[PDB]
Design an enzyme around this catalytic site. Structure first.
Site, PDB file in Angstrom:
ATOM      1  N   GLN A 107      41.432 -58.592 115.454  1.00 38.13           N
ATOM      2  CA  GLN A 107      42.297 -58.768 114.403  1.00 38.13           C
ATOM      3  C   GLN A 107      43.750 -58.440 114.797  1.00 38.13           C
ATOM      4  O   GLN A 107      43.898 -57.327 115.405  1.00 38.13           O
ATOM      5  CB  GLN A 107      41.953 -58.263 112.890  1.00 38.13           C
ATOM      6  CG  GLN A 107      41.600 -56.742 113.301  1.00 38.13           C
ATOM      7  CD  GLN A 107      41.316 -56.233 111.803  1.00 38.13           C
ATOM      8  OE1 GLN A 107      42.146 -55.236 111.427  1.00 38.13           O
ATOM      9  NE2 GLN A 107      40.164 -56.482 111.198  1.00 38.13           N
ATOM     10  N   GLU A 160      44.431 -60.905 109.868  1.00 38.58           N
ATOM     11  CA  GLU A 160      43.780 -60.225 108.730  1.00 38.58           C
ATOM     12  C   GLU A 160      45.080 -60.403 107.853  1.00 38.58           C
ATOM     13  O   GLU A 160      45.988 -59.457 108.126  1.00 38.58           O
ATOM     14  CB  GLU A 160      43.353 -58.820 108.979  1.00 38.58           C
ATOM     15  CG  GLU A 160      43.010 -57.936 107.643  1.00 38.58           C
ATOM     16  CD  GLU A 160      42.838 -56.633 107.733  1.00 38.58           C
ATOM     17  OE1 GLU A 160      42.691 -56.243 108.937  1.00 38.58           O
ATOM     18  OE2 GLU A 160      42.486 -55.891 106.818  1.00 38.58           O
TER      19      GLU A 160
HETATM   20 ZN   LIG Z   1      42.223 -54.121 109.519  1.00 41.93          ZN
END
Ligand SMILES: [Zn+2]
Ligand SMILES: [Zn+2]
Lengths: 174, 183
Positions: free
Chosen positions: B26, B92
């Site tokens: 991420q 994210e």
């Molecule tokens: Zn994170």
């Protein structure tokens, strides 16, 4: 406050065929000292340097780091760059020449005012064994796995102070 | 200044076997207005929302966006979180509740003082066709592909002003490996 599940779905469109082969290739971070960054990302985190690019007139270098087997790196330079820059999930580390010699210079990690970017994050099979090794190698922690509310999740920092989440996807439902 | 190829390689170590199953999962960006961000990342860039998490006490939500087929998303909640958080190359997006209504609030994109993070980047089959579509969708550009030093590469911005590179891997040798003239 916060979006309902229904409101979030009402905002989503399904993928257009014009996007079908798009991939999320890179995250770019500026690094003060590429010697420290390369050692950290390779030796500590186990990434591979897959491509280096130098811009001698603009005085910067790019280092592309990825979880790739070094044996998969093509030997011919044009094939190698087309391979490196078509990998998913690479880090592009930007070295502005001379920052490593400037005692007054540092980059901003995004986690204090003014905020934006927060962190990158690495999925591991075992947060505790990963973090024990990080501790043995002298990695600085933002959050040890059992510190604070969310047990079994860690944050480390790289040599520039960028936050790196260490998470085990199989434990995250808890 | 700058490292030689040999010096840079010498600063690298071979990957320790204990790291061989690690993945870069991420990149986290804070977003002012999740509705604008979801429309942008799903419709304009063709990503899929694979997981939404809400933290009512801490007053934030997480949205995980990825290039994944929605038909691969498990239906069962715990299997779905384990699947979503084991995908490579996700975004994210963090929504701190109330930012969307605060006229004075904006996040910092890292490209003016104080700098750090610069951009995410999307690899595409054809930068020119991708950018023509982006122009048709009213996307804000930082750099068109036929402007500036690095021709064939574009930068667009998302609804928070984060920079997104648009690159074609097969054009990067000419951009990055060719001999450059001094003036
Ligand atoms: Zn994170
Ligand atoms: Zn880039």
């Amino acid at each position: 406050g916060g979006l309902t599940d229904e409101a979030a779905l009402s905002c989503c469109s399904d993928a257009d065929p014009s996007t079908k082969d798009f991939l999320l290739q890179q995250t770019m971070l500026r690094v003060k000292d590429p010697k420290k960054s390369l050692d950290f990302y390779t030796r500590v985190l186990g990434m591979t340097l897959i491509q280096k690019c130098d811009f001698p007139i603009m005085k910067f270098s790019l280092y592309f780091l990825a979880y790739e087997d070094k044996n998969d790196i093509p030997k011919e330079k044009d094939e190698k760059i087309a391979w490196a820059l078509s990998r998913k999930a690479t880090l592009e580390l930007t070295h502005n020449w001379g920052t490593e010699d400037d005692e007054t210079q540092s980059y901003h990690n995004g986690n204090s005012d003014p905020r934006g970017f927060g962190h990158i994050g690495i999925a591991v099979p075992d947060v505790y064994s990963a973090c024990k090794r990080f501790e043995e190698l002298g990695v600085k922690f933002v959050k040890k796995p059992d510190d604070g509310k969310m047990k079994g999740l860690a944050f480390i920092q790289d040599p520039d102070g960028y936050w790196i989440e260490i998470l085990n996807p199989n434990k995250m439902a808890t």
